[PDB]
Amino acid sequence: KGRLIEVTEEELKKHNKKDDCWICIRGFVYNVSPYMEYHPGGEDELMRAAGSDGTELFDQVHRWVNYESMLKECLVGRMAIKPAVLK
Amino acid sequence: KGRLIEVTEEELKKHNKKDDCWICIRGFVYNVSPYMEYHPGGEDELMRAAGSDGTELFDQVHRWVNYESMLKECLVGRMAIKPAVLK
Numbered sequence A, B: 001k002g003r004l005i006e007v008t009e010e011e012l013k014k015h016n017k018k019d020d021c022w023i024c025i026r027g028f029v030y031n032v033s034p035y036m037e038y039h040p041g042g043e044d045e046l047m048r049a050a051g052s053d054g055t056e057l058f059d060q061v062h063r064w065v066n067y068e069s070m071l072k073e074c075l076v077g078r079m080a081i082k083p084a085v086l087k
């Protein structure tokens, strides 16, 4: 139970510390704390997106990196949507 | 004295509550708590950037709003930089 969740922005922003770092990329939310020590660009760079939507930063440095496959085991879930999104 | 300070990432993240809400826009840090009740987009929207760098969110909704003049009385200071930034 509880493998994949809906993530509100309020929830996402709680996870803004190195040891508890969530980032949203294209609506998918990942727990990148276990990846911190491996990121080729270093920890400080990854932390620029801590607790936030990292899509723009990600796209400005390496748009084609296969994050979905690399981070699959760290997938938290998906960002919540406003009902109007579905109009 | 003490009107403008250097703001670290650690310090910025502490000011994440509605009554003590700091937002960084383009390196400038503002305590927006007094502005909460006036923001045309409402309080929830402004809270999306609480205790964080709000530049991307700000630019996604109203790039041209004159925040420097509007929020001048709320200016905390500037984000810290690493020495390497000055190379």
Ligand code: HEM
Residues within 6 Å of the ligand: A023, A032, A039, A040, A041, A042, A045, A046, A048, A049, A054, A055, A057, A058, A061, A062, A065, A066, A067, A068, A070, A071
């Ligand atoms: C969202 C904030 C991120 C920032 C600011 C960032 C920044 C960087 C930077 C500066 C580099 C070195 C690029 C260069 O010197 O050309 C890099 C490399 C790399 N990063 Fe990130 N990164 C972010 C997120 C991620 C994430 C989430 C992943 C993994 C899913 C990732 C995987 C990689 C990979 C695979 C490389 C090496 C690409 C190559 O071999 O050329 N990055 N990153």
Ligand code: HEM
Residues within 6 Å of the ligand: B023, B025, B032, B039, B040, B041, B042, B045, B046, B048, B049, B054, B057, B058, B061, B062, B065, B066, B067, B070, B071
């Ligand atoms: C922190 C400094 C900010 C200032 C000084 C500011 C100022 C303003 C102003 C002047 C408007 C009305 C613009 C108009 O007349 O067309 C507005 C609306 C709005 N604001 Fe902000 N804002 C700030 C931050 C933010 C942030 C960070 C967000 C998003 C997280 C946001 C979300 C919105 C939204 C959604 C609207 C209504 C936009 C629309 O319906 O087109 N604001 N704000």
